[PDB]
Structure 1
Amino acid sequence: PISPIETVPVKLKPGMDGPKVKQWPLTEEKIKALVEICTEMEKEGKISKIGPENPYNTPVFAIKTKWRKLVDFRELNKRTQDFWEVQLGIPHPAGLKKKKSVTVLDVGDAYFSVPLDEDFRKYTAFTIPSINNETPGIRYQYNVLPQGWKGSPAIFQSSMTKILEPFAAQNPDIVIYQYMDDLYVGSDLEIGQHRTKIEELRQHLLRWGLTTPDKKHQKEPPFLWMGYELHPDKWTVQPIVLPEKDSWTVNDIQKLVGKLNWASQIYPGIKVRQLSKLLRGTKALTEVIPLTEEAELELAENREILKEPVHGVYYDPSKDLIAEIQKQGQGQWTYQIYQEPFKNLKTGKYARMTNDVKQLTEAVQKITTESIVIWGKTPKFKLPIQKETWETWWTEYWQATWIPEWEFVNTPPLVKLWYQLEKEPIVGAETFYVDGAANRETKLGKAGYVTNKGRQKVVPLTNTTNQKTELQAIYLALQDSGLEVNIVTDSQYALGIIQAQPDKSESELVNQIIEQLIKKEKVYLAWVPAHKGIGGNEQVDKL
């Protein structure tokens, strides 16, 4: 019940007054069950009865083998100061250590067990109607953390934390995790000692006014906690079920791709590429979207890896931490986090929002951040790239980039750079003076070149853009050239794309250019100011 805990002082947001909300009378049958419960928790000191001296007020409702009392504190919540933010996010099972025993304890009636700051109790007042509605109303306030109030979770937390401290000191061999209204207590003491200490905790708590489950009612493993299966030596996601439907709604696609990523912390190889390409189409809310063909293969592959159940181990800090990365295709990567070879701590995927290597770097970041969060260190990495490849790319990349200690793993699809541009123009190679263009309104375009040997081309283009033709120009010079070619363009856009050494794209143009560049033996690409009058006479022909 209400505890000898010291209250946390609360005040209202600056220059605000307490709620003075309206109370429209309700069912006479309701008004009955309300007072039956309302004066049964007054006798327990959770509420009191005050006169009309206080002007604030809030509304109260009923809901249902019995009834239950509810107070929409929305108007008060908007008016009370902000607090420390109740912890955002959850401990990941991958980052717990195997303890010989773990007991779960849920505190009964938590918020009602903690006193509410005295000089802020006036702002919790409500009125129970007198049926006749002209008959007078009985006024109550709260003496404890009201249900669903803004301050309740955060004050409750700090009361619990404080109450734990005296026991945490007498017993440094046990480990209490806090989560909302639960306590999770592990220990590596023989099951007799551990069961003795659990009862020591319950009694401790009970003397602070926090009821808690007896050994008879202490939950038994595996534990069904926050969508996980917590076995005393293994963890897994709870059973995940994917529907076989004919039609699919926007919402139905949202709920599916969620249950899949969820599954991907521990089921390796899961993909969501084509499945989500669909929702990205429009912001439709409940429109029906035809399952596309590629998506269908993805869902079939996901269904296959989900058919068998997969488990992860927990963390042992004495054994180092490893992360391994696989490329999957079309900008999809998978990785595993483990300490020994036959069970993973957890798994996951990265996706491209680009060069094959850049993406890898971004994935090593994603993992690195996640490791720091979950375990407090970074992994050593096993990576599908030759050290000489990496050293070449970063030394020449315009961003600074960091690569924690890593090792090469000769497990394809290896990650490679597919072509490199020449640093200086090629002697004994034809030089191409490309350009391109189009008309905003007309949407027709022209691309061509003019080489030093006097060769010249122009190709008409429909449904093109000043930028899409500037890349067509380059593709023309690659189609019509020997194994060594010098190309010259006035388009920074096109120079930018090619210099980025992209490995693939959705733009099929760029893919063809890539297959040309991988085919060529030596290409030097060079940039000159547009409309400056040096060999750019090729813009006249395209113009």
Structure 2
Amino acid sequence: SPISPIETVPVKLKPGMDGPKVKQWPLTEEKIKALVEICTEMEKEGKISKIGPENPYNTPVFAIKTKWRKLVDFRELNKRTQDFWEVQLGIPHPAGLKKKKSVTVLDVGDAYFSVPLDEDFRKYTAFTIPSINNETPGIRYQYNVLPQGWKGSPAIFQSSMTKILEPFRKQNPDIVIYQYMDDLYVGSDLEIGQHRTKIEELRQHLLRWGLTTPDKKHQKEPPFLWMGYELHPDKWTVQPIVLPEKDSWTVNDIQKLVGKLNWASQIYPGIKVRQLCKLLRGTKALTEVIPLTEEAELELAENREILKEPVHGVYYDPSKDLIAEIQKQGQGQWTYQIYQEPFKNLKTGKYARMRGAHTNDVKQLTEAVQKITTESIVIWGKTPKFKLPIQKETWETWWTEYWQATWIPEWEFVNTPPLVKLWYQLEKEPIVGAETFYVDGAANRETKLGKAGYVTNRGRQKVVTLTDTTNQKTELQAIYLALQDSGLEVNIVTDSQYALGIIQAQPDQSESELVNQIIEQLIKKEKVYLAWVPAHKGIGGNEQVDKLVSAGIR
């Protein structure tokens, strides 16, 4: 196997650091023999060279098993090697692949061993095959090539592959080359002949540079199995997903289930994972059996149904626009599809996130549009045209009245229920002929006890005692009280910016049962006007609820 004639990549150690000096542990005779055999073969091939006694560095060697393998413990050298640039920013996604007339897979033979190592850095790769019972001096070698397990190998190989491919890519702009690890994926729209000719020209260019690749009878045939994907000539899919039928599910079983479903989510539309994920909440043992809930059984059933039949994705056509469609699956769950030609999907996906403790479908939909937008730029270098289950008017009302700079690129309403709506709207001005509730909450921070209440301009009053509470929980409880004893139209005055904030953002869902109860009330209401005052300023009705809730508390 050749060692590429390319210019070496200069390697440095970390500033203030010298090479490893880790003592070789004595080995068994069988391990020493195995290593001697291995090392003399590599020495012949040019891979390693014998060194003198002057070299003071050392990295330990070991051998494991009918054939023997040599394992170098590069942990110490790796701790002293300079940092390298990140090999890759991401992984190619199948949906980003164009449909090519012919595609061939070329894997590089003994990749790392085919590329030289900086002459001035070779000294730090020094290792010793010990003598029987460490009696006499050992056999000393250093690497001439990129060693397996060393920190710079992935990076230096990739960089070497880049400089090599450079002149070929310049003279063949209509040829696709995917660089992945020690593989090269070559695609073109040439006729089955001039492509076969171009592959040999590539193979030959690579050989002139120490890199060996398979010939026609050894190169793989489609479908290509790569990274959990199946790449057929006119479609792609995920590899066979088989969901286990278990009597008892363990933490580990559900974890593997969730992972498999998540992976299936990229092409199979409608995959749900919330109810299964909920079972994984908390601290439970790998082998601990989790009984499924009704909701988890229902979600598993729907998922088995989705996966019953096989689904495929199509490839990318650069001359067509991408269309992204989103649907509300349920509570906090969003599902999307991306296509160019109606309903022939390139890919699919899901969004189920909790951005805060209080949110709404409008905020969730914009969060999903941003997630999809980013993804599209990564996969295709362009954003899609959205088809959203929200009316232009609902969106317009939200962005106009919300405090946050909220935006959505080119979109269109699509009537695919459940539709995204605002469940209630707060008043802009106080209501004439509605009772004004002044609300307050106060909790003692030693006892944890608090009081929640209100006073009205109609002389009405109420004070409820609460047990293991906070000032925030009491303030929210006070609002709930005022909503409960109110009637269709209310003006509410609070000194809580915290409560003001939650309610003002029009939440339709919360991780707080109290906030969900407030939502239930706000919906039933015809008109609500929420106003704010500074606390402890002796303000009108505010000083009155203050004295009432403070009594025996603060």
What range describes the TM-score normalised by the shorter chain of this pair?
Answer: over 0.9
Asked whether the 8 Å contact 1:111–1:147 carries over to 2, the reply is yes
Aligned CA RMSD, in angstroms, stands at 2.0
Partner of 1:233: 234
Once residues 276 and 186 of structure 1 are traced to their aligned partners in structure 2, the CA distance between those partners, rounded to angstroms, is 40
Select between 242-251 and 329-338 the one with higher mean Cα deviation.
242-251
Select between 47-56 and 500-509 the one with higher mean Cα deviation.
500-509
Q: CA deviation at 1:92?
A: 0.6
- 3-state SS, counterpart of residue 224 of structure 1: strand
- 3-state SS, counterpart of residue 191 of structure 1: coil
- 3-state SS, counterpart of residue 11 of structure 2: coil
Q: For residues 211 and 65 of structure 1, do their structure 2 counterparts lie closer, same or farther at Cα, with a shift above 3 Å needed? A: farther
Asked whether the 8 Å contact 2:55–2:123 carries over to 1, the reply is yes
Once residues 395 and 182 of structure 2 are traced to their aligned partners in structure 1, the CA distance between those partners, rounded to angstroms, is 49
Q: For residues 125 and 467 of structure 1, do their structure 2 counterparts lie closer, same or farther at Cα, with a shift above 3 Å needed? A: same
Once residues 536 and 463 of structure 2 are traced to their aligned partners in structure 1, the CA distance between those partners, rounded to angstroms, is 19
Once residues 371 and 404 of structure 1 are traced to their aligned partners in structure 2, the CA distance between those partners, rounded to angstroms, is 13
Q: Deviations over 1:310-347 (max 9, x none)?
A: 11111101011111111122211111111111221111
Q: Deviations over 1:95-154 (max 9, x none)?
A: 111101110010010110111111111111111122242033111111111112111111
Asked whether the 8 Å contact 1:422–1:524 carries over to 2, the reply is yes
Asked whether the 8 Å contact 1:323–1:338 carries over to 2, the reply is yes
Partner of 2:249: 248
Asked whether the 8 Å contact 1:435–1:538 carries over to 2, the reply is no
Once residues 198 and 126 of structure 1 are traced to their aligned partners in structure 2, the CA distance between those partners, rounded to angstroms, is 40
Select between 93-102 and 158-167 the one with higher mean Cα deviation.
158-167
Select between 275-284 and 96-105 the one with higher mean Cα deviation.
275-284
- 3-state SS, counterpart of residue 285 of structure 1: coil
Once residues 12 and 506 of structure 1 are traced to their aligned partners in structure 2, the CA distance between those partners, rounded to angstroms, is 51
Once residues 324 and 113 of structure 2 are traced to their aligned partners in structure 1, the CA distance between those partners, rounded to angstroms, is 46
Match of 1:389 among 386, 389, 394: 394
Q: CA deviation at 1:450?
A: 2.3
Q: CA deviation at 1:542?
A: 7.4
Q: For residues 284 and 444 of structure 1, do their structure 2 counterparts lie closer, same or farther at Cα, with a shift above 3 Å needed? A: farther
1:464 aligns with 2:465: no
Q: For residues 267 and 539 of structure 1, do their structure 2 counterparts lie closer, same or farther at Cα, with a shift above 3 Å needed? A: farther
Q: For residues 495 and 300 of structure 1, do their structure 2 counterparts lie closer, same or farther at Cα, with a shift above 3 Å needed? A: same
Asked whether the 8 Å contact 1:47–1:143 carries over to 2, the reply is yes
Once residues 283 and 535 of structure 1 are traced to their aligned partners in structure 2, the CA distance between those partners, rounded to angstroms, is 53
Q: CA deviation at 1:381?
A: 0.7
Once residues 305 and 534 of structure 2 are traced to their aligned partners in structure 1, the CA distance between those partners, rounded to angstroms, is 56
Q: CA deviation at 1:466?
A: 3.0
Q: For residues 63 and 88 of structure 1, do their structure 2 counterparts lie closer, same or farther at Cα, with a shift above 3 Å needed? A: farther
Q: CA deviation at 1:463?
A: 4.8
Q: CA deviation at 1:408?
A: 0.8
Q: Deviations over 1:266-319 (max 9, x none)?
A: 111112212222333248666554433422322222222122221111110101
Q: CA deviation at 1:480?
A: 2.3
Asked whether the 8 Å contact 1:433–1:535 carries over to 2, the reply is no
Once residues 153 and 279 of structure 1 are traced to their aligned partners in structure 2, the CA distance between those partners, rounded to angstroms, is 36
- 3-state SS, counterpart of residue 262 of structure 2: helix
Q: CA deviation at 1:249?
A: 4.0
Select between 226-235 and 471-480 the one with higher mean Cα deviation.
471-480
Q: For residues 119 and 172 of structure 1, do their structure 2 counterparts lie closer, same or farther at Cα, with a shift above 3 Å needed? A: same
For normalisation by structure 1, the TM-score amounts to 0.95
1:488 aligns with 2:493: yes
Matched ranges for 1:20-59 at <5 A: 20-59=21-60
Once residues 451 and 278 of structure 1 are traced to their aligned partners in structure 2, the CA distance between those partners, rounded to angstroms, is 46
Once residues 89 and 273 of structure 1 are traced to their aligned partners in structure 2, the CA distance between those partners, rounded to angstroms, is 27
Q: For residues 296 and 465 of structure 1, do their structure 2 counterparts lie closer, same or farther at Cα, with a shift above 3 Å needed? A: farther
Identity of matched residues, % = 99
Asked whether the 8 Å contact 1:418–1:503 carries over to 2, the reply is yes
- 3-state SS, counterpart of residue 345 of structure 1: strand
Q: CA deviation at 1:444?
A: 4.5
Asked whether the 8 Å contact 1:448–1:542 carries over to 2, the reply is no
Aligned residues: 543
Q: CA deviation at 1:171?
A: 2.8
Once residues 171 and 540 of structure 1 are traced to their aligned partners in structure 2, the CA distance between those partners, rounded to angstroms, is 80
Q: Deviations over 1:372-399 (max 9, x none)?
A: 1111111111111111111111122111
Asked whether the 8 Å contact 1:450–1:538 carries over to 2, the reply is no
Asked whether the 8 Å contact 1:530–1:536 carries over to 2, the reply is no
Once residues 341 and 376 of structure 1 are traced to their aligned partners in structure 2, the CA distance between those partners, rounded to angstroms, is 21
Q: CA deviation at 1:481?
A: 2.3
Q: Deviations over 1:42-93 (max 9, x none)?
A: 1111111112121111111112232122211111111111122111421011
Partner of 1:366: 371
Select between 24-33 and 100-109 the one with higher mean Cα deviation.
24-33
Select between 176-185 and 324-333 the one with higher mean Cα deviation.
324-333
Q: CA deviation at 1:263?
A: 1.4
Select between 444-453 and 94-103 the one with higher mean Cα deviation.
444-453
Q: For residues 56 and 541 of structure 1, do their structure 2 counterparts lie closer, same or farther at Cα, with a shift above 3 Å needed? A: closer
Asked whether the 8 Å contact 2:475–2:496 carries over to 1, the reply is yes
Partner of 2:441: 436
Q: CA deviation at 1:358?
A: 1.1
Q: CA deviation at 1:260?
A: 1.9
1:515 aligns with 2:520: yes
Q: CA deviation at 1:540?
A: 4.9
Q: CA deviation at 1:464?
A: 4.2
Select between 514-523 and 411-420 the one with higher mean Cα deviation.
514-523
Asked whether the 8 Å contact 2:439–2:542 carries over to 1, the reply is no
Asked whether the 8 Å contact 1:49–1:139 carries over to 2, the reply is yes
Q: For residues 401 and 132 of structure 1, do their structure 2 counterparts lie closer, same or farther at Cα, with a shift above 3 Å needed? A: same
Asked whether the 8 Å contact 2:102–2:189 carries over to 1, the reply is yes
Once residues 547 and 353 of structure 2 are traced to their aligned partners in structure 1, the CA distance between those partners, rounded to angstroms, is 36
Asked whether the 8 Å contact 1:98–1:315 carries over to 2, the reply is yes
Q: CA deviation at 1:492?
A: 2.3
Asked whether the 8 Å contact 1:430–1:481 carries over to 2, the reply is yes
Select between 340-349 and 167-176 the one with higher mean Cα deviation.
167-176
Partner of 1:407: 412
Q: Deviations over 1:175-213 (max 9, x none)?
A: 111111000000111112212221222222222221111
- 3-state SS, counterpart of residue 341 of structure 2: coil
Asked whether the 8 Å contact 1:110–1:156 carries over to 2, the reply is yes
Q: CA deviation at 1:7?
A: 0.8
- 3-state SS, counterpart of residue 13 of structure 2: coil
Q: CA deviation at 1:412?
A: 1.1
Once residues 166 and 258 of structure 1 are traced to their aligned partners in structure 2, the CA distance between those partners, rounded to angstroms, is 42
Task: Mark the runs of 5 or more structure 1 residues left unpaired by the alignment.
Answer: none
Select between 305-314 and 254-263 the one with higher mean Cα deviation.
254-263
Asked whether the 8 Å contact 1:448–1:538 carries over to 2, the reply is no
Select between 504-513 and 22-31 the one with higher mean Cα deviation.
504-513
- 3-state SS, counterpart of residue 434 of structure 1: strand
Asked whether the 8 Å contact 1:10–1:81 carries over to 2, the reply is yes
Once residues 229 and 190 of structure 1 are traced to their aligned partners in structure 2, the CA distance between those partners, rounded to angstroms, is 24
Q: For residues 542 and 275 of structure 1, do their structure 2 counterparts lie closer, same or farther at Cα, with a shift above 3 Å needed? A: farther
Select between 454-463 and 49-58 the one with higher mean Cα deviation.
454-463
Q: CA deviation at 1:261?
A: 1.5
Q: CA deviation at 1:441?
A: 4.6
Q: For residues 15 and 506 of structure 1, do their structure 2 counterparts lie closer, same or farther at Cα, with a shift above 3 Å needed? A: closer
Select between 374-383 and 498-507 the one with higher mean Cα deviation.
498-507
